[PDB]
Amino acid sequence: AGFQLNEFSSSGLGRAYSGEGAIADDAGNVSRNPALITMFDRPTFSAGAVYIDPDVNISGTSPSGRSLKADNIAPTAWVPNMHFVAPINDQFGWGASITSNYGLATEFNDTYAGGSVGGTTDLETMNLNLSGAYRLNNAWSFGLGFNAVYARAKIERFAGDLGQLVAGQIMQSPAGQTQQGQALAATANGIDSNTKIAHLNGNQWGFGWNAGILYELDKNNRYALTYRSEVKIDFKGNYSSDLNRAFNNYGLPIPTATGGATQSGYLTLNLPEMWEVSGYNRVDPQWAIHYSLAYTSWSQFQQLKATSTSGDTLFQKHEGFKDAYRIALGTTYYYDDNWTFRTGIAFDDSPVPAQNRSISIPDQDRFWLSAGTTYAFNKDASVDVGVSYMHGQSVKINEGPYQFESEGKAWLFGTNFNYAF
Ligand SMILES: CCCCCCCCCCCC[N+](C)(C)[O-]
């Protein structure tokens, strides 16, 4: 959903992803902890989807006087997940999984006065995870998996009112007192709002791996320590710019003008490392508790550079992050033989220094408020229903020459089905 926990299941979506990595009622946490494999005695799959309907709005006014307002820049999305877990011995067991990874969808109206720093920022990743696990004894379990990350990316930026803004930076400038000068302002005054200053898109695979350990006080109380590797996406796409090649080589903040000519861009993205610790304690045949303390290294993601075969910067964007923490407490109610009742809150800390808040990268991941319930038909198959209320912040921003006043929120609704063999 945000900068820390993806959407791998509707059960978790119901417990605000608390104690993931220790819980194991269903075939979903395996993707969260390999070692949890030794927690299943028979083949068990689980498939599903999670729908996301956000509400992110930007606001403020351009020096150029035009409005910097934009409602719902975050579209809606559906996200599937399929899991499969099965034993091999009494010590070996494997499991596959296909879920989503880090991703954001920011989309402004090409005719927005904020083109320069707000156009289209889409990152959608699908992750296939293969993994096994070895159980040393009745208390220690270890798992290790491999996961190739597919990455569909796209970036575009425009010239909202920037052009007419610069035009007035000249008429006020001393060179605007000159023939060659005031003829150079009109040029930049012509430029319409939806002119592509930057356009990049590529599609390549990522490779990483995670490690999981487990430890149970018994069949009813456990704890987990997991680590997740960073994925290096080396993107081989194409670059464009509807700007005229004549702006080039003056050292101006460079979205490289190629006059619509498709070049060949190069960009590397870093998909952060994780080190989550979680604890599962079933204190009552009816009730149990889960809680996790994760940690992602967004420090690894510092820019969004884009080069050419030559290696020169085609487009340069700075982020400069910082590691963030996440905490989640959750309660599960095993009421009936047919029903369950989960609940949870979860606080995520922003991996973004105030001074680098962009509008393409919404800064609205402040906490989780979730609920859910599962109806089982007969010990071998059931259906999970989850829902989360995710809220952001009232944080002001300063990017380029504008003043925005962002915000955020979002509701998650998921529905999962499971089965044992
Ligand atoms: C053509 C390449 C486009 C690159 C798109 C990469 C965007 C990386 C943004 C990371 C922001 C964090 N996230 C995933 C949680 O939204």
The span from the CA of 406 to the CA of 399, in Å, is: 12
Amino acid at 139: A
Which ligand 1 atom sits nearest the alpha carbon of residue 200? Answer: 1
Q: How far apart are CA 291 and CA 117, in angstroms?
A: 38
- How wide is the angle at C-alpha 127 spanned by C-alphas 274 and 200, nearest 5°? 95
**Using a 6 Å CB cutoff, which residues line ligand 1?**
3, 102-104, 123, 153-155, 200-202, 235, 237, 267, 269, 361
Residue 396 CA to residue 417 CA, distance in Å, equals: 42
> Quick check: 345 and 332 in contact, CB under 8 A?
no
Task: Determine the distance separating the centroid of ligand 1 and the alpha carbon of 271, expressed in angstroms.
Answer: 9
Nearest residue (by CA) to ligand 1, atom 13, is 103
Q: Whose Cα sits closest to atom 1 in ligand 1? A: 201
Comparing CA positions, the residue from 4, 7, 2, 14 lying closest to residue 339 is 14
Cα distances (angstroms) measured from residue 139 to each of 212, 214, 216, 217: 14, 8, 5, 7
The count of C-alpha atoms lying within 13 angstroms of the C-alpha of 391, restricted to the half-sphere facing its C-beta, is: 9
- Please name the residues in contact with 383: beta carbons below 8 A apart, sequence gap of 6 or more: 374, 375, 377, 415, 416, 417, 418
Testing ligand 1's pocket by substitution, the residue of 6, 52, 101, 123 carrying the most ligand atoms inside 8 A of its CB is: 123
Cα 199 to middle of ligand 1, angstroms: 14
Q: How far apart are CA 12 and CA 414, in angstroms?
A: 10
Supply the residue whose CA is at minimum distance from atom 15 of ligand 1: 3
In this structure, are residues 292 and 277 in contact, taking their beta carbons and an 8 Å threshold? Answer: yes
> 268 CA distance to ligand 1 centroid (A)?
10
Name which residue sits closest to atom 4 of ligand 1, judged by CA. 153
Q: Are the C-beta atoms of 313 and 334 separated by less than 8 Å?
A: no
Q: Retrieve residue 284's tokens.
A: 């009552």
Asked if residue 145 lies in contact with residue 210, where contact means CB atoms within 8 angstroms, the answer is yes
Ligand 1 pocket mutation, candidates 102, 264, 352, criterion most atoms within 8 A of CB: 102
Ligand 1: centre distance to CA 103 (Å): 6
Q: How large is the greatest C-alpha to C-alpha distance in the chain, in angstroms? A: 85
Tracing tokens 């945000």 back to the chain, one arrives at 2
CA-proximal residue: ligand 1, atom 16 (nearest):
104
DSSP state letters, 93-162: EEEEEEEE-S--EEE--TT-TTGGG-SEEEEEEEEEEEEEEEE-SSSEEEEEEEEEEEEEEEEEEE-SSH
How far apart (Å, rounded) are the C-alpha atoms in residues 156 and 151? Answer: 17
Query: What is the distance in A from the centroid of ligand 1 to the CA of 270?
Result: 9
Domain containing residue 365: CATH number: 2.40.160.60
> Where does residue 371 fall: left (phi above 0), alpha (psi -120 to 50 degrees), or beta otherwise?
beta
For 245, list phi and psi in degrees, rounded to 5.
Answer: -45, -15
Taking alpha carbons only, the member of 420, 344, 347 closest to residue 380 is 420
Which domain, by its residues, includes 224? 1-421
Q: To what resolution in angstroms was this structure determined?
A: 2.8
Distance 363 CA to ligand 1 centre (A): 13
Distance CA 95, CA 190 (A): 59
Q: Which helix (H) or strand (E) holds 168?
A: helix 162-170
Q: Specify the amino acid at residue 251.
A: G
Residue whose CA is at the smallest distance from ligand 1 atom 8: 123
Strand partners, 139: none
Q: Which residue in 414, 415, 421, 420 sits closest to 52, CA to CA? A: 414
How many angstroms does the Cα of residue 169 sit away from the middle of ligand 1? 33
Burial of 327 (0-12, 13-18, 19+ CB in 10 A): middle
Residue 77 C-alpha to ligand 1 middle, in angstroms? 16
What Rg, from alpha-carbon coordinates, does the chain have? 24
Q: Which atom of ligand 1 is nearest to the CA of 121?
A: 5
Relative to the CA of 365, which ligand 1 atom is closest?
A: 15
* Residue nearest atom 7 in ligand 1 by C-alpha distance: 123
Q: How many domains does the chain have?
A: 1
Pairing of strands 196-218, 238-240: antiparallel
